[PDB]
Design a binder for this molecule. Structure first.
Ligand SMILES: CCC[C@H](N)C(=O)O
Ligand SMILES: CCC[C@H](N)C(=O)O
Ligand SMILES: CCC[C@H](N)C(=O)O
Lengths: 307, 307, 307
């Protein structure tokens, strides 16, 4: 019955494609779709920091005719231990969708399990699915057909972006490669889900510790922070392992000539990515960030007309 | 000139009836009254946690045509000791009403003493009058006439809910009973005010330490947390005295067969209310929370046309 | 191309009069200009506490038909060290202007250097130009023309208000005097720029340690806090030096008989300004606060049609 979006494969390949096509339509006509007219509300809850997600969601919602109630969960009664399920049943009386940036996926599942409106993952510890929709809209407007392109991700292969690039990348027909060192590879379960979905789309999943091989011939190079939110006090050395995986000019010179570079941001310039690459001719980082707005609006128009 | 809503008896019986009738009408047509179109502003200021108050005011104001400016007081100049009177005088220059969730009642009185727009209590240590209007709206849509109903509240009978249920209840013509251990009875001057208001409406006020007597034949049964915001560090055991006052199936079984159960939320499941009661057939808990939206809109409309 | 408002002299004198003429028209017809209709977004970012700037900007954007995204910067990725240039380039994809209350002026220069939308100083350690636009509107509406009035500022002559009164005063043709102890004097390059602007408008700049001589004959007396945000820990006694500079009944008695008193707020009553003055017949303080709303809206309309 009600459609949620907690992870990238919650959209079938055909569904993802309808979303991305609508994304491109909304980018060209931003304020003419008003499913939340009223204004109907949408909850937008943050447990972690945000710039791109906060702005793109709040504005998108307003552009759909609705009203984002944007909160830090700590100042809600979640900070005083109201259960996630009571919260979600309450929010279901006020809003038409619940967008949440959180820690463990289990938290999203708890709310999704009783909510009577779409729950949307605005970033968890294990996935960042709205980002990869914006990533894919950006690749599509630059390259055309998504099916059969090669995309390589570099760095922490166990974080939310690695995971979502895998699931959303194969959902789109894309051969995805994760280049990561050995403490830091995708979760087996996510890798299994990606392989499962790739079978239906013609895609493939490669996981390697050879950055040079991952880069070579690639159509899209992607990276992300070596230390994500939640990982600060994990005690690991998060510099030494990742140095070989830095997205720099040696690396990019191995890719296909028309290759593009993505980074979800915020970037720690000099670490995972260098200035010359980020501010170079291949970077699509600013268009990528912008698409957060157009992609999430499409997602929401699509989820709402199905719920 | 100027009507504030700082505690429940700030409305007369006839006025409360006007507000509740309008609450009913706005539930039916939520966007048909737009007295704040423009948008005009309303200030919504939080010194404490919230989910239901935050969402229902922010959205209810937007559906009245207006725009809520929602802030934690700690990031305003209130956090650098600007006085409450200066703050109120300045806010009366931007917004058409000031909604404030705070501690001592005296702080609301300080703002209401100089403000030139309605000040509205969105919870204080002593009263929670917007909650009780939602309660009454939910009672009325389930049972019809309010006059003559029998309501009992259980638990911490010294808290804002107990005071507000006593005052809003008897204003509605409802026989109110507060059932609580000896060390947590209503403030006697609140209780006296309630007895005075009861003489006008045919209501009554009862304070009891016997839960079973309070449940017997009750039409509505209400409870709330046993540790309110601001009580966390009073050092008292706030489980043991309250156990006999728990709202569970055996207590509920004593009530009228058509009795309903209310809880303002957030609930501590297994303490003041059991899963079995809260999720049972008698529970009006979620309609109650929805009715915050409607009741506060009605309240806003009424106050604005009188100020 | 694109006009920023980082400091008062960013407007030439003809441009400032355009903005203030607009302010007065918008005070009379507040929803008559909708350039942000859509809604288009505007970033409103806080590094420091705020009441007046928060409410005036948020509501004023809404009244121009747009949507303000209001954030404390600690919650954004600025809190996790994303560079200002990256933040600005990203915001430029989402919003139509960036309003920022911050610390060093160089942070605003950093953003404005790469931003493709107008950056607007909602207060920095150096300037507070939007406040002075509201100050000028409130003088104009009480005294008529601005050219050739006498304005005196008292207290910390090196703070952001001293600098804006200097630059925005002379730009309006106002003879500006700063009365401050000798260790608290306007930054030399701000005084120079003010002297240079005064030559084009026929105004003048005076700086003195003599509070009595500064009050004698003044049309406008202005003060501000002795310890601004950010100065709490400089090690200075910030009471003893400024006592001779207190805006009290004695000093007001020296002014022109039709003099007005202004104070940006928040006020530490009993320090820089007394109750008798603040609350007496010369005080234009509440109207001054309200005019933040009208003056910022005009500035936004004006900047947007030129960017
Ligand atoms: C947009 C932030 C993504 C990053 N992997 C994190 O969780 O911090
Ligand atoms: C709505 C919360 C009510 C509770 N008595 C409290 O003040 O915390
Ligand atoms: C509006 C505040 C003005 C003061 N100079 C400060 O910087 O704190």
């Amino acid at each position: 019955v009600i459609r949620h979006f907690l992870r990238d494969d919650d959209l079938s390949p055909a569904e993802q494609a309808e979303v991305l096509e609508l994304a491109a339509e909304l980018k060209k006509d931003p304020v003419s779709r008003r499913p939340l007219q009223g204004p109907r509300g949408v909850a937008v809850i943050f447990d972690k920091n945000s710039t791109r997600t906060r702005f793109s969601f709040e504005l998108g919602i307003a552009q759909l005719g609705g009203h984002a109630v944007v909160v830090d969960s700590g100042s809600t009664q979640l900070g005083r231990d109201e259960t996630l399920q009571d919260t979600a049943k309450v929010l279901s009386r006020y809003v038409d969708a619940i967008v949440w940036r959180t820690f463990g996926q289990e938290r999203l599942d708890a709310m999704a399990s009783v909510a009577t409106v779409p729950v949307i993952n605005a970033l968890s510890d294990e996935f960042h699915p709205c980002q990869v929709l914006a990533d894919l809209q950006t690749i599509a407007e630059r390259k055309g057909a998504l099916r059969g392109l090669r995309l390589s991700y570099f760095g922490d292969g166990a974080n939310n972006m690695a995971h979502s690039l895998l699931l959303g990348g194969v959902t789109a027909g894309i051969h995805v490669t994760v280049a990561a060192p050995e403490g830091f590879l995708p979760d087996p379960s996510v890798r299994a889900a990606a392989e499962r979905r790739a079978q239906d789309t013609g895609a493939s999943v490669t996981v390697t510790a050879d950055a040079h091989a991952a880069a070579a011939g690639a159509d899209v190079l992607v990276t992300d922070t070596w230390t994500s939110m939640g990982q600060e006090n994990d005690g690991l050395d998060r510099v030494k392992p990742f140095r070989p995986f830095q997205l720099n000019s040696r690396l990019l010179a191995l890719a296909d000539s028309d290759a593009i570079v993505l980074h979800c941001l915020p970037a720690h310039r000099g670490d995972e990515i260098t200035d010359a690459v980020m501010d170079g001719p291949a970077s699509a980082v600013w268009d990528e960030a912008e698409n957060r707005l157009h992609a999430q609006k499409a997602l929401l128009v699509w989820l709402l007309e199905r719920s």
